[PDB]
Amino acid sequence: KSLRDQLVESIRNSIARNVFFVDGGKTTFINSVVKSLNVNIKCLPTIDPTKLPRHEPILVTVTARLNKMVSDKLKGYRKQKEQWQNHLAQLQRGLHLLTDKEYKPEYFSDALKLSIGGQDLSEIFEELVKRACEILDCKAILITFDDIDTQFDAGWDVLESIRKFFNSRKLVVVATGDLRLYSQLIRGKQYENYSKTLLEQEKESVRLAERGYMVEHLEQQYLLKLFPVQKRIQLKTMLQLVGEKGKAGKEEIKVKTEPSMQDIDAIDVRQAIGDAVREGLNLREGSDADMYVNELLKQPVRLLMQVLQDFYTKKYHATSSVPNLLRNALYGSMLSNIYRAGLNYEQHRFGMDSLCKDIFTYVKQDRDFNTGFYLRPQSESEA
Amino acid sequence: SEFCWLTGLLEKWRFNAPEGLERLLWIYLLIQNQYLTLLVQRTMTELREETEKSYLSRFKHAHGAGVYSQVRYLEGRFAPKSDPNKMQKLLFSVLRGYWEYLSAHMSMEWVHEKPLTISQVLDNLELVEPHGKCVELALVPHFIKRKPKNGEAYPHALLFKDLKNQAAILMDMLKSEPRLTGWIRGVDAAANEMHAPPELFCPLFRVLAKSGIAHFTYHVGEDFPHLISGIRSIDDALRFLPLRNGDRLGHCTA
Ligand SMILES: [Zn+2]
Numbered sequence: 001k002s003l004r005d006q007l008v009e010s011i012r013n014s015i016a017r018n019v020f021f022v023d024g025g026k027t028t029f030i031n032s033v034v035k036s037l038n039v040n041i042k043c044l045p046t047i048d049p050t051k052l053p054r055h056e057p058i059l060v061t062v063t064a065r066l067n068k069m070v071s072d073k074l075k076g077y078r079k080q081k082e083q084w085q086n087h088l089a090q091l092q093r094g095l096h097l098l099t100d101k102e103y104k105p106e107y108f109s110d111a112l113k114l115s116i117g118g119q120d121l122s123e124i125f126e127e128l129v130k131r132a133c134e135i136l137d138c139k140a141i142l143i144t145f146d147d148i149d150t151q152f153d154a155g156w157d158v159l160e161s162i163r164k165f166f167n168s169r170k171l172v173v174v175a176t177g178d179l180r181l182y183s184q185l186i187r188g189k190q191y192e193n194y195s196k197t198l199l200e201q202e203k204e205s206v207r208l209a210e211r212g213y214m215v216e217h218l219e220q221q222y223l224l225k226l227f228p229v230q231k232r233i234q235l236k237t238m239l240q241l242v243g244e245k246g247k248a249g250k251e252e253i254k255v256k257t258e259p260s261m262q263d264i265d266a267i268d269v270r271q272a273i274g275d276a277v278r279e280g281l282n283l284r285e286g287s288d289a290d291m292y293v294n295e296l297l298k299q300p301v302r303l304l305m306q307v308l309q310d311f312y313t314k315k316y317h318a319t320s321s322v323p324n325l326l327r328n329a330l331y332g333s334m335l336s337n338i339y340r341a342g343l344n345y346e347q348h349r350f351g352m353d354s355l356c357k358d359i360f361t362y363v364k365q366d367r368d369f370n371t372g373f374y375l376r377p378q379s380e381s382e383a
Numbered sequence: 384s385e386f387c388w389l390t391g392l393l394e395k396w397r398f399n400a401p402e403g404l405e406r407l408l409w410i411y412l413l414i415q416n417q418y419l420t421l422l423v424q425r426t427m428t429e430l431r432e433e434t435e436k437s438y439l440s441r442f443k444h445a446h447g448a449g450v451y452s453q454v455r456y457l458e459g460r461f462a463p464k465s466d467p468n469k470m471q472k473l474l475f476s477v478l479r480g481y482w483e484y485l486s487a488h489m490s491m492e493w494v495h496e497k498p499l500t501i502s503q504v505l506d507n508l509e510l511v512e513p514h515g516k517c518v519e520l521a522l523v524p525h526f527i528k529r530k531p532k533n534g535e536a537y538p539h540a541l542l543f544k545d546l547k548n549q550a551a552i553l554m555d556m557l558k559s560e561p562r563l564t565g566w567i568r569g570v571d572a573a574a575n576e577m578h579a580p581p582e583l584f585c586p587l588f589r590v591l592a593k594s595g596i597a598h599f600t601y602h603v604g605e606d607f608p609h610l611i612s613g614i615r616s617i618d619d620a621l622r623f624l625p626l627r628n629g630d631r632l633g634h635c636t637a
Contacts, residue, residue, distance in 0.1 A: 089502065109499055 001251075003236050004033045010231065011172060012039060015139050019162060019173035020231040025301050026147050026176050029235070033174070034144055041172075042069070042138040049158055050151040057098050058161035059125065062143060063091060066132055073136055080135050087128050094119045122165045133170050140170040147177035156185045159226060179227065187219045238304070239297030242270055245290060257312045273297065276311050280326025295377045299333075307333040337383045341365070429462070433473055438480030445518050446484070452518045460571065463524040463549040470552050471501065477522065478504040478566075485517050505562045523600065524553060526572035526587075528579035539579050543587075550587055554594040561595075569598030573633075576606055581620040589625045599630055604637035613637025 011020055022030065027046075034043050044065055052061060067088070074081050096107065097119070111119040129141060143166070148155035155177065162173055194211070202208070243249035254266035267275070273293045274285070283289040296304065307329050314325045331338070331347075339345065343361055344354045363372030366379050396405075432438075438459075447453030459477060464470045482504055486493065491510060495503040513519060526546055531539045557564060570591055572584050581601055588599045603620050607613035614637045620626075 093500070093502075113495070113499065113503075 001032075003233065004029055004036060007033055007233055008036045011037075011142070011174070012041070014172060014231070015039075015041060015169075017162070017167070017173070017226060017228060018169070018171065019166075019175055019227060020233060021175040021177075021179070021227050022233045023178065023235055024147065024176065030144060030146070030174065030176055034142075037142065040138040041140050041142055042133075042136050043142045044069075044144055047143065047145040047158070049145060049148050049154045051146075052154065055099075058145075058158045059098070059121070059165050060095070062161075063128070066128070066141075070132055070135060080131075084131055084135075087124065087131055090124050091121070091128065094121050094124055097121055122167070125165045126168050129168055129170050140172055142172050142174060144174045145176065148181070149177060152177075152181040152185060155182065156189060159186070162226065175227070179223070179232075182227070183219055183223060186222060187215060190215045190219055237298075238269075238301055239294065242297060244294065246270075255308070258316065270297070272312075273308065276308060276322075276326060279322040280311075282323065292377065299382075303333055334383075341383060433469075433476050435476045435480040435483065438477050439483055442480060442484035442518060443487075446488070450488070451516050454518055455515060457518045457520050459520050459522040460573075461522065461524060462527070463553065465545065465548055465552075467552050467555070471556065474556070474563075475501050475504065478508070481520050482507050485511060488517050501560060501563070505560065505566075508566075509562070520566065521568040522566055523569050523571045523598075524549070524567075525574075526570065526584065527574040528572065528576070528583070529574075530578045539583050542579060543583060546584070546587055550591060550594075554591070557594055564595050564597075567596070569600055570596050571600035571602075571633075573602045576602060576616065577608070580616065582623050585623050585625060592625055599624065599626055600633060602633040604635035605633070607637060610637055 007020065007022075014020075030046060034046060037043050044062070047058070047061065049058070070084060071081075074084075093110070096104075098121070100107075107119075113119075116123055133140060145158055148158075158175075159182070166173055199211075202211075238253075241251060242253060253269040255269045255272055256265075257267045257272055258265060270293065273296055274289065277283055277293055277296070278285060278289050281289065281292070283292070299307075310329045310332065311326060314328070315322070318325065341362070343358045344350075359373060359375070362375070363369065366372055392408075442457075445452065445454045445457055461473060461477065464473060478501060479498065482498065485508075489511075493507050494510070495507055498504045498507055526549075528539075529542050532541055535541055553567075553570075557567070570588070572581070581603070584601065588596075592599070601620055601624060603617045604613045607616065617632070617635055617637055620632065626632075
């Protein structure tokens, strides 16, 4: 909202690397941002890297969307068309470079045809964007890429698409995700550059150490260039968007709890959470319950929205126990969390027998051993 | 080379010859003759014709010894290959030979002086115009009909598999480069007739036409069991093949 607006302003005063990034929901925010831009810059349909066959280059995908946009802006109302197919064919012909698992020599004389020397696909792409903005009468093109949480590996590829092809001043990148995975993947295939025999032989702490230093420094430096900090976006969180304990509350959220909910029955968001917990927790309205719900307002918006949408849903269903309607919701919310916790899974074996053993397991895993039975969500792990 | 060599040899033997060398010459010439007879009365050797040397030779022969081409309109008939790659290799060979032939007679801005892809070749060629000094090429793929095999769903099913394969290859090149249609003008179905009757090809010819193949040709009347049989073949071809005005059949010896 406000965040997307500042971001819009930031990219706008950028045409005057060239890659804004959004930490982190994420997709909703990015879609809203793109709607915002609809100082002439033309946007691209959002790029979902995880939603692409294992064999495409980000560049081919970009070329496809660009093809559509150019062609239809062209069928709207020539020689510009005629000029475009030349670049298109040049791209097709030089396209092999990326795919080819081996160099075929015939590509040599191919490279011998005719402004840097060779068949630079990146320069070809730059004339491509030149033609595109020349024809669309736009200052630049936005390339909008989705997070790669579902496939953090394909993202690397977009990174090289950027580095090798998007070092142009009429293109701007909008990346989204967690830079931690970026770091890992870039590191992972940094390590892949070494020679297998090398590490196979030098398996000693000393040399392990300095190569780790080298790889980590290179990862850091390369992330610096690819994602220069200035244009990165931190984004405001839901609890950051909500009063910590009531001494805040820029832009009250308010949520719907009943089907009627004629915009005046909205029971805040913090207050709805507190009711759900206290009554499902039989928790009183004291300080710990508050902080309990603060350690709830962290959770990712999807998880919290599901867990608080199945809460009142089933309460209304039963009303035409709060703790069990809420317990069933927590079960779905943390199931794989609880599943990897190694704790009771079957629902037909609830009892109070399994509860004591499971509490023992939780306290041992949280270490503690002093107030673990308090079951405070104070652990470092979100699991 | 052979011309010059034999000329010199004969000159040296103008008055006489060593009988041994002369026996060598009989045997040489005879071997030539019988090998040649075998050849005429008749794959890899043809594949060896897949360079822009044989076709350039063909074109230089087609053109006379004079400045103007002895022939006007040439038909370039070629065997289709089941591989897209072999197909395109052959096509590029033919096209480059033709372009070089034309260049050897006309001077003009060739865009790609040393073309390397069929696209570049057509880029060169489209600048050519029909003055008539050189030959005008028209290209046609052969369809070879083989005897039906022992077991299959229906007669000539496998042969039809192969032919549809070749045809798909062809239409897909046409798609990729529509400009060739100015050059691949018609498709012909040749070879010994009894191995397959024409109707096997009517859908093939129809789909090819819709692909954009103007013209169609089919050998007929050449060889047959009975003269009536050949006549029947020819007429059925007439009444079945998607042949339009001006199309041409072939031998029709019946
Ligand atoms: Zn014939």
